[PDB]
Amino acid sequence: LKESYLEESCSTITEGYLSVLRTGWYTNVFTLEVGDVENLTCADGPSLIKTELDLTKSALRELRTVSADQLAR
Amino acid sequence: LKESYLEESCSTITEGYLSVLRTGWYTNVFTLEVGDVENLTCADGPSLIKTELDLTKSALRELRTVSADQLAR
Amino acid sequence: LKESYLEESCSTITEGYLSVLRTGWYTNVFTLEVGDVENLTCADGPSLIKTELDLTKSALRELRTVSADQLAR
Amino acid sequence: TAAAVTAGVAIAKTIRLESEVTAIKNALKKTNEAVSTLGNGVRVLATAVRELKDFVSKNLTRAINKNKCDIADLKMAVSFSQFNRRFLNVVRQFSDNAGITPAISLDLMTDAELARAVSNMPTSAGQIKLMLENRAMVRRKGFGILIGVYGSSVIYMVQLPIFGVIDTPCWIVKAAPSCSEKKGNYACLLREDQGWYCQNAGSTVYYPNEKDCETRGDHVFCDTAAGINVAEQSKECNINISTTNYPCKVSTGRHPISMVALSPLGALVACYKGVSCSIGSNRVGIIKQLNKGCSYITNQDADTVTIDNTVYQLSKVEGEQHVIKGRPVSSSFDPVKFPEDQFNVALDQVFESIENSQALVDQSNRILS
Amino acid sequence: AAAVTAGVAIAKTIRLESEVTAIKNALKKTNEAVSTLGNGVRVLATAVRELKDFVSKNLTRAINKNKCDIADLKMAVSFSQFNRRFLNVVRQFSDNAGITPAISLDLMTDAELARAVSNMPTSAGQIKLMLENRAMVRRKGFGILIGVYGSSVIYMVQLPIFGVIDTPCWIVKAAPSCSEKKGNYACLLREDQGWYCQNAGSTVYYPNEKDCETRGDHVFCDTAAGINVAEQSKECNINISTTNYPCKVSTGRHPISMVALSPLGALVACYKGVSCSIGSNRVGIIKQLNKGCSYITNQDADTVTIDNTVYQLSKVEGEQHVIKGRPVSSSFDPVKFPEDQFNVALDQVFESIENSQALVDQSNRILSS
Amino acid sequence: TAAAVTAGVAIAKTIRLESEVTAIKNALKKTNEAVSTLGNGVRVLATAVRELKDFVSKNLTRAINKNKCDIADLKMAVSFSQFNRRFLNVVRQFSDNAGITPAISLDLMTDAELARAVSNMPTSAGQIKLMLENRAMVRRKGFGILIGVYGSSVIYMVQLPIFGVIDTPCWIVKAAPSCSEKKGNYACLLREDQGWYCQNAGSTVYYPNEKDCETRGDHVFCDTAAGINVAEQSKECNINISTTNYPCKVSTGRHPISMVALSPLGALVACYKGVSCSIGSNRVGIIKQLNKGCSYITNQDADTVTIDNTVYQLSKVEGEQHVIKGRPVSSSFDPVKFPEDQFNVALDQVFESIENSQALVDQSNRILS
Ligand SMILES: *[C@@H]1O[C@H](CO[C@@H]2O[C@@H](C)[C@@H](O)[C@@H](O)[C@@H]2O)[C@@H](O[C@@H]2O[C@H](CO)[C@@H](O)[C@H](O)[C@H]2NC(C)=O)[C@H](O)[C@H]1NC(C)=O
Ligand SMILES: *[C@@H]1O[C@H](CO[C@@H]2O[C@@H](C)[C@@H](O)[C@@H](O)[C@@H]2O)[C@@H](O[C@@H]2O[C@H](CO)[C@@H](O)[C@H](O)[C@H]2NC(C)=O)[C@H](O)[C@H]1NC(C)=O
Ligand SMILES: *[C@@H]1O[C@H](CO[C@@H]2O[C@@H](C)[C@@H](O)[C@@H](O)[C@@H]2O)[C@@H](O)[C@H](O)[C@H]1NC(C)=O
Ligand SMILES: *[C@@H]1O[C@H](CO)[C@@H](O)[C@H](O)[C@H]1NC(C)=O
Ligand SMILES: *[C@@H]1O[C@H](CO)[C@@H](O)[C@H](O)[C@H]1NC(C)=O
Ligand SMILES: *[C@@H]1O[C@H](CO)[C@@H](O)[C@H](O)[C@H]1NC(C)=O
């Protein structure tokens, strides 16, 4: 780069940069689904994965409240 | 909404929007506590949960250092 | 603190504040490495730890793409 | 020899008997050798049964109770991370941003809690309704502050916007240089009114940059700090710029400036001097080249403004469209069972073979009496 | 006499002849009992063999199988534990794509941060202040992912150096001061509003209030936002019409009614058709304000109202929550074997073998005579 | 006679026989007790062997299948987190920021997906190449929006910048007050040109703040919104401030302002009146005192500028260098093995002793027949 001292105006110009200017927006849409999970019928009641599913079920219920379109609530 | 072109001033007005203007701040205060965990006395020393507790106790020891009031440090 | 009302200019001055001004930048460099993990050959195929590593391996492969210097890609 | 015939038979039978009891003595001699041998079988069998128990009792239950402990160990670790998500998520967030949160995250305040806070805000009923519908904005326009870590507890504050002014007329101004030329001289006007305007009581609020207000549908969420209060008469600039009622803020230039300014529903284009300004479409390339001067076009008129070799997009360009699904999680439970029937009958067999033998040594004792 | 002896001979031999045949039958029964008990012990052994076959093969296998998953999961969980920092740091650089808004707790620990500040090129007092407000140091700083090499992550943290501390600072707010004579309005409005920090040889002006952050009495000001002004500019807060400095003031011909908030109070501008009033949170309205510019303290009221628009002077404190997670418990329930009652039975077994063995030695003893 | 002799011997011999059979009678009587006795050993062994099975069959396999079940449970929990990382991570981010993402994170869109998108953007080949090379910037200058949670699906949109204009000349202007003095009075002019200038087709774009454009190598990534279109003739202001060709934006003052203005490659210093401005090094405090007036110095000329007692750093100050590795993860797998060879030798032993005992009573029966 080259930086020139401008004594007349007590200023400096620094040139040699190259532009990157935004001219638009390009959009992709994603759909994420949770994978299938098998039913654990060897246990009774409070399993570690049922409590893991109901936690992630709930995380989605709350995440829902903040959706972009109103018709998702 | 409807957007009007002003040919005399090379400008555009777009009308039909509705305002949402902030007039104040409303605050809630939260206190989060860690759930109780039983002492695992069937094992000796390095348990996966003791190192998990000593990890988050350490996480909190560090989080403390950035608290808002000084009298918490 | 002291806040004075200047009625001729319909303005307020509030004094008694103290300055904290940035005069430079001080920088540290970090290198974080993942600890060694033993090969669990007592199992067949899908290990829980084998897939956890292949996750951390791809997370790094993807994280590489966003590194600051090009000669890291 | 009358006597001798009888006397001869007696010694004869005695000889036949003498050899018979010695056979029985030898027979019995082998028999208690068999009894003794079977005993040493049962002894070795018993010692085996003892060694089998010691492995089951000691070496094996040791392994089970160990695995039983590690199982309880991991269930506790995993349960801890589960039953304490919010706590752990919140500590993560205040750490990542070092004490402050850019938004009121879902972890920072649940929807139930968020709605309950908004309903207790000091405002009118209709304004509460709007916040409830745009609670996303309430969250983002608000924030959270870490107050302290006290012992083992985390105390923080969420700070919510109070939307006291709503549903008042609002509009936005965009402008381009309106350059006029006579005899190689350029006279260039440019509005400096440009930005967001929201009508308020006793004044009009002016937000100079477009980012200063956030658009969600017809509603505009405008940042209080950015606002500059201007007289209502400033709006007159959109009928007549040369109005004497308001000092319409407009700048003059001596040189031509070619540019594109995007509006909500369109764009202002300025073509002067040596520029090739043209309009484009989605499929085809050119639909009209623009005349020199100030032109206004709609998002529904075109999708492209081209200046020389620079193509400006008027609307968002819709790209690929993905769908991703995780790998399935399946159960691996395959229990072990012991085939008890074939065994349980075999032991009945044993107790019965015991019972037959016991009775036979009783018959033998009877016969001896 | 000769024959007499012969008759007695047959007599005793016959009395004996029936006895040994009784003994012979007795021994035959016994040999069937020994043979019978044996076919029993054999059946007991094959069952003990199958019990081993189940324990030795099918049961320990299931235990070693479970032993392996146990070791597998312990490794997975330990990995995430022994490598939290590594994994947290990689998480953050991914979520923000190469850069970090703050110096997070994972990026640089409190120990590391403090050692860094102490080795900064500044005075003891400046080092002290950064150590006291290290929260701010973190936020005014940021982090950069330099590169991922193989399996290692290299990044740089960038810390602010606060070299200027404890110099006088103040903030200016104003509202339009409109004057009226014979139905015409003259409105002047200060445009110097903002943060002022005095520095060596100059005074720095930060035009927007967001440009400086308040923590107690200290003001942390963003250097880029700063504009250098002559020290005499402070003179504008005594006489606006001072000739010593070109006081930046705008004039208007129209009234602007508004509320401008101060740190310790607020400026109110009531002109023309507005009903400006003062309120409280507990009591509804406490005073209607006279037309003109009023200054009220945050401790004078809690609310300024303009027509039907209500402005809050202070933060409104809402609910106050406390949340604790579900308790985590151990499910450890070891299995124990009833060893005492059993081992008495084995001792029981070993004596009946030796008692029996002692008996077959006696049987043979009698036979050796 | 001879008869009496032989019969006489016969009767005598019967006496010798009665005593052998009376011992044999007693001997067998003992043997039958050993057979009966050994049996009570075998039975007690069978009952003992039965409870060993009852423990293995019931109490032990119960504990194992329980542990086998918990194992499968934990595996499912941990697999769920693994097979669904991206899903869970994406939900995590939209929750921390309430519906919007500051950047296009690695979880939101993979490198593969990003490169495919950029390659399908509506622009020229060289521009696609440049975006691909600075894909970091692409992610950061873009963002992500949560569209909706539909059932169990999370649907979101990533928005990428289109860099259609590239590699055109760009420069940055910095300035300090230029004060001249004649007979104790100061006349001070100061440029207001300061900022980023980027040349475009038909106009020049001006970005007023240094933060409005981001530097990655020689390339300058400039915020479109911050941009002001200025005439091309404006670049003439870097030759003659007093040019009549352009209305050069420069302000005048009556008071001196001493300050330091930082350049990319150096710094502008303004020393006036009562200030002691000097340039320093990192080690030594002062290496040169600066003359009164406007001075320009290089990053390679000094490392420090001092104004009175305030020290300004010209470059970033390089501090420590840390290197960290996580604790090694080891396996806890320790299988249990059953000594089957040693055990089977004992059972082989039992089965032979059975056959040996069985074979002896057969000799016994041969002897009787
Ligand atoms: C981790 O281990 C696997 C398996 O090692 C095998 O199992 C051992 C008990 C022993 O039998 C070794 O000789 C085996 O190699 C590593 O090897 C892969 O294993 C498959 C068959 O299991 C073999 O065909 C592949 O060639 C092996 N892979 C390679 C690249 O050679 C595996 O590589 C180890 N992983 C690491 C990171 O070291
Ligand atoms: C735009 O307005 C200007 C000025 O008129 C202003 O608005 C009027 C309602 C009234 O309040 C005027 O006093 C304001 O100044 C018009 O231009 C000039 O108007 C003056 C009247 O004062 C007249 O003497 C001049 O000759 C007019 N100039 C020209 C060139 O005609 C102008 O006509 C208005 N334009 C349009 C399109 O309505
Ligand atoms: C600066 O320029 C002054 C005159 O202004 C104009 O400059 C050139 C670019 C032409 O536009 C010309 O027609 C104008 O008159 C000069 O008087 C002055 O000497 C110049 N100063 C220096 C230091 O060169
Ligand atoms: C069984 O356990 C004992 C200690 O209780 C130990 O000495 C022996 O070596 C172990 N053997 C096996 C095969 O585990
Ligand atoms: C036990 O394992 C054997 C392999 O040695 C297998 O053939 C058999 O089916 C299994 N039976 C039970 C009851 O587990
Ligand atoms: C073994 O199981 C029985 C039920 O089958 C139960 O009554 C007994 O208490 C158990 N013993 C142990 C030590 O678990």
TrEMBL record, chains A, B, C:
It is found in: Host cell membrane; Virion membrane. It comes from the Viruses. Belongs to the paramyxoviruses fusion glycoprotein family. This is Fusion glycoprotein F0. It comes from human metapneumovirus. The chain holds residues 19 to 91 of 502 of the full protein.
TrEMBL record, chain E:
Disulfide bonds join 169-197, 178-187, 212-221, 236-247, 270-276. It is found in: Host cell membrane; Virion membrane. It is a single-pass membrane protein; Single-pass type I membrane protein. GO terms for cellular component: host cell plasma membrane; viral envelope; virion membrane. Keywords: Disulfide bond, Fusion of virus membrane with host cell membrane, Fusion of virus membrane with host membrane, Glycoprotein, Host cell membrane, Host membrane, Membrane, Signal, Transmembrane, Transmembrane helix, Viral envelope protein, Viral penetration into host cytoplasm, Virion, Virus entry into host cell. The chain crosses the membrane at residues 142-165. One of its GO terms (biological process) is symbiont entry into host cell. Glycans are attached at residues 58, 239. The keyword Ribonucleoprotein does not apply. Belongs to the paramyxoviruses fusion glycoprotein family. This is Fusion glycoprotein F0. It comes from human metapneumovirus. The gene is F. The chain holds residues 115 to 483 of 539 of the full protein.
